[PDB]
Amino acid sequence: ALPDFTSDRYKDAYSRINAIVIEGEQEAHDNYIAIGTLLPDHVEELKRLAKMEMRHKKGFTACGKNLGVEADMDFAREFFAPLRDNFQTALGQGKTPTCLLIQALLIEAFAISAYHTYIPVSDPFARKITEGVVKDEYTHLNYGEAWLKANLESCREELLEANRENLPLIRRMLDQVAGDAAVLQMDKEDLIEDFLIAYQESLTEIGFNTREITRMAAAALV
Ligand SMILES: CCCCCCCCC[C@H]1C[C@@H]1C(=O)O
Numbered sequence: 539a540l541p542d543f544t545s546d547r548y549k550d551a552y553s554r555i556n557a558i559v560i561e562g563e564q565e566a567h568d569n570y571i572a573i574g575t576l577l578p579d580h581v582e583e584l585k586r587l588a589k590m591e592m593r594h595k596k597g598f599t600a601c602g603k604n605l606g607v608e609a610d611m612d613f614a615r616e617f618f619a620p621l622r623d624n625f626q627t628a629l630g631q632g633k634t635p636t637c638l639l640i641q642a643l644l645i646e647a648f649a650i651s652a653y654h655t656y657i658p659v660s661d662p663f664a665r666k667i668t669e670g671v672v673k674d675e676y677t678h679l680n681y682g683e684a685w686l687k688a689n690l691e692s693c694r695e696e697l698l699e700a701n702r703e704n705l706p707l708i709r710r711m712l713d714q715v716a717g718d719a720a721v722l723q724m725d726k727e728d729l730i731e732d733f734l735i736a737y738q739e740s741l742t743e744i745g746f747n748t749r750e751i752t753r754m755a756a757a758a759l760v
């Protein structure tokens with residue numbers, strides 16, 4: 539079941555998935571620095587999280603070089619453009635809860651699910667790097683959960699709306715790269731299950747009850 543990491547078929551799919559990961563890590567660095575403009579008293583903790591994202595970017599860049607793959611960065615920039623646009627719109631409006639739901643909840647849960655699914659089908663070099671990034675993703679999820687938990691009563695409506703707009707985008711993003719992910723021996727159903735578990739757990743921690751979490755699923759489905 540392990541892929542042939544040397545095949546042209548594998549390298550071609552890896553060129554796009556690796557580019558998406560590298561671009562995602564860079565955008566995550568930029569997103570945490572940007573949140574510092576909304577939360578000036580959190581600048582030092584946000585700088586620490588952003589520095590972790592740059593370490594992740596460096597490690598994943600090394601994964602592609604190790605396999606002799608040239609990352610398709612243009613494809614990766616286009617892939618993230620709709621979610622990037624929604625983050626920038628919220629940032630411009632000073633909508634800290636939306637920025638945090640996009641980056642610290644949705645994007646971190648997408649990273650955790652992708653990395654968890656990739657680990658068992660990864661080459662030995664990339665496996666160690668990916669295992670070494672996972673604890674940081676939980677730190678990032680925890681940062682977003684803690685702020686949203688502390689501020690839940692002022693932003694329930696905004697979070698429902700951020701979810702309605704951005705959760706279907708994450709679903710479309712998975713559909714776009716499910717083909718390449720299957721070449722990497724990653725199952726779309728496992729990617730979805732892990733993402734939903736992480737996202738449900740974050741919403742529970744923040745303070746949403748079962749009905750409210752189901753309302754968020756209903757809003758995204760409508
Ligand atoms: C189907 C597998 C596609 C891989 C998607 C990976 C998205 C990158 C997630 C990184 C930006 C998140 C972070 O570092 O917090």
Ligand SMILES: CCCCCCCCC[C@H]1C[C@@H]1C(=O)O
Binds near residue numbers: 648733734
């Ligand atoms: C990596 C996993 C990304 C897919 C998770 C998205 C869950 C789908 C939930 C409802 C909002 C989707 C829709 O039908 O538009």
Ligand SMILES: [Fe+3]
Binds near residue numbers: 591
């Ligand atoms: Fe990261």
Ligand SMILES: [Fe+3]
Binds near residue numbers: 566674675
């Ligand atoms: Fe992260």
